[model samples]
Target: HTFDDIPMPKLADPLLIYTPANEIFDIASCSAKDIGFAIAHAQIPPGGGPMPHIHYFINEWFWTPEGGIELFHSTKQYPNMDELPVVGGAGRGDLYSIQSEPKQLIYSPNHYMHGFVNPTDKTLPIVFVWMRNEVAPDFPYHDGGMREYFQAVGPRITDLNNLPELTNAQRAAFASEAPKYGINQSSYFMEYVNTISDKLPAQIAKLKNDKDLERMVEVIEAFNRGDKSVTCS
Candidate 1:
């Protein structure tokens, strides 16, 4: 018998999967394992992203594994995300977002139209690991959040290694189930981004004391140049 002190290897079979947001996703460590830091492996197909959405109850943290993602966050001013007219912030003007390159980290505290897309060449897919954690103070365990949503919405995959393309029905079902699990997803997310292309460096929120953003921006901008050598101040 394997003792608690002797860790054993686990097999990857979906381990049971499927984000066929169809994102070819799987979870590494679940919420119960960490008190609430549920970690998941999400593989994004080219030109794909979760529709922009706001989390009213959960905080999301993400980092890339291979290649990079165009991480986005809405800067449209709001008092409370839960108070918006549209549960998903759908009724809005063009939103703004930041671009974080390879290996960059993005911490989108709950309640914003946040999302990311694989920005690599159109022929390849990219993988990223994300952590879903509860924001409630003294919240030690997640209430089966992201894992629950994807389970109900993502297709049943017998083989993680082979999944087929998703349909409009699959995508529609995903959007429908999102809100019940704490996510409010906006529609036409990619279209929204296109509307504001002329406004790159779109209106972003101010850094604390208006000084914290510069350091983060310098490094992020460097990534666009495919180079980095500055110390974060």
Candidate 2:
């Protein structure tokens, strides 16, 4: 498929805003709406890479066309890098542009921990393509302590890196709330999938089993689907 053949706004137009944050270089298409797919060209500088983070509504697939890159995936978050798990799917690709070089592709599912690292001293250019599955009126990410917990414990879980400052209290809070939202679970997406699908009957069943979780889900759902004129209670 040819991207240039698609009828869309130019990069300079207001519909496609160029957001340069940290080392990420990409342009977002406003006209595509939040539900539509977006594309970007990413340059991973030497010794630089993105932290382990998951997407709520977007599934990202990237093709690494140049330089050396490393990928990691895990479910546990350790206090530091030294405690991270290192058993599956670590170094799996050759990053070079040659006739025999295999183009590397990574498919990151929704609500999974995944990211990359540039091991070489030179900049690696990766063509990143992202497809948005669901569209909310506003930002759609699991925030609060969830993101913080992942950032703090992610590296340690997958890379054996170290971070000694994570406190017991913080760990406890995360452990309690995270599973409620399927944070560190391999079946995280299944939790959400089961909720919306099956005519939402299972969602009611979950509530029947756990009153507290049920009520919490009800309140959040109301707030999200409520009319603009309605006030949150």
Candidate 3:
């Protein structure tokens, strides 16, 4: 539906949710308004990020007002889990990265596999906004479910500063409920599914090299400046 048809979310009080990886403060909830949009503020910890997943129905936007984040995007789907790295780290997808500094905005449309990692050793602050076409045909996997997913997966929090420790059982529960909301946890290691390009091997190699990550960052930054397009090759 149109924005004019939906009432705005009341900002007098905001709801908050805390997970092991990140904290979300809801400025607006889709359930509170029928505008097909919701907004939130997210705080991500160092070396923390969501597992590789895809939203089949909704578009996402991330605005970094403070701290730095290394954003990763790819049209490729998640690779087989067995082929992923044994040690915990970014997965093996055809990755295109963007180094997001303060005041930068990043947008991810539906059906594009994407996720971000806090590249630095400090906390990252970001504003997350979701826009959906509620009237459009629902994807079998996703039905514009965001707030419901958070409610099912994330633990409610009253205090943002002092978050309770997340237990292993809670983490397991979160993973279990993911598919219910159209989220597929494909790979623990954030990796590319396809590697058909000759140049892609070098790019992937560089992304894995800690010392060479800066070079890849430069490449993506250049691409962002030029055409605002992501190239795996």
Candidate 4:
């Protein structure tokens, strides 16, 4: 689709969602022309972050514009894919952590166990872009299932400036619906056995030198700032 046909993010009046530790802004919905991806801006406070989880089909990428965000990733791979860890169960896995710089980009492919934490006392600002290969014929822009999952789980924000706490019911509902989006909420250690490697350093270096990923970040940032002139194509 042409830029003219693409729907822009409502930066001035964006849809907001709140969790206990973070406030998320839906910058680009799955309904947009960018059919393979959905983007969100997240503000994570200290000691707050997502638990270790695996995306069965989606590749998740992150860009930190402000604050140093610490990422934890598992390098272990399951031997028998058919027999995976039970959701929220315990297992064995080797993990590593890295602190990201401002404007830095990180890529986590599908089936990789990953999560981030704000190590400092202040809040961290991050942009999350999730992409998957599958798309619906009827709704070409549907983000595989991320948008629908978020909509079903996240509570609507009445005040853009101040976010409200998520009710217990909302959190429970989110957990229940995670499997529908191919999310494995089970911790990595519960499934894959631990292995030693320098994968995290190598992956970080690769993403740091990835010009294409850098360009994508630039384009998305521009779009987030209400600049529709930039195009990915």
Please tell me which predicted candidate would have the highest lDDT against the true structure. Answer: 4
- Residue ranges of candidate 4 with Cα displaced over 4 Å: 1-8, 11-13, 30-35, 78-83, 86-90, 134-141, 187-233
Model 4 per-residue lDDT tens digits across residues 155-204: 87787666677887876666566777777554323343344343465654
State the lDDT of candidate 3 residue by residue for 12-103, as single tens digits: 45567775345554544432122244456677787777765666545666667763787666645433323332235544456566667666
**Candidate 1, lDDT over the whole model:** 0.49
Q: What is the C-alpha RMSD of each candidate to the true structure, in Å?
A: 11.6, 16.2, 12.7, 6.4
Put down candidate 1 lDDT per residue, 91-116, tens digits, no spaces.
55455555544544455556656676
Judge candidate 2 at residue 114 and give its lDDT. Answer: 51
The whole-model lDDT of each prediction reads 0.49, 0.36, 0.53, 0.59
Error of 4 at 137 (Å): 9.4
Task: Report the candidate with higher lDDT, 3 versus 4.
Answer: 4
- Candidate 1, residue 81: CA error in Å? 5.3
Lowest-sum lDDT 10-residue window in model 3: 1-10
- Model 1 quality (TM-score): 0.63
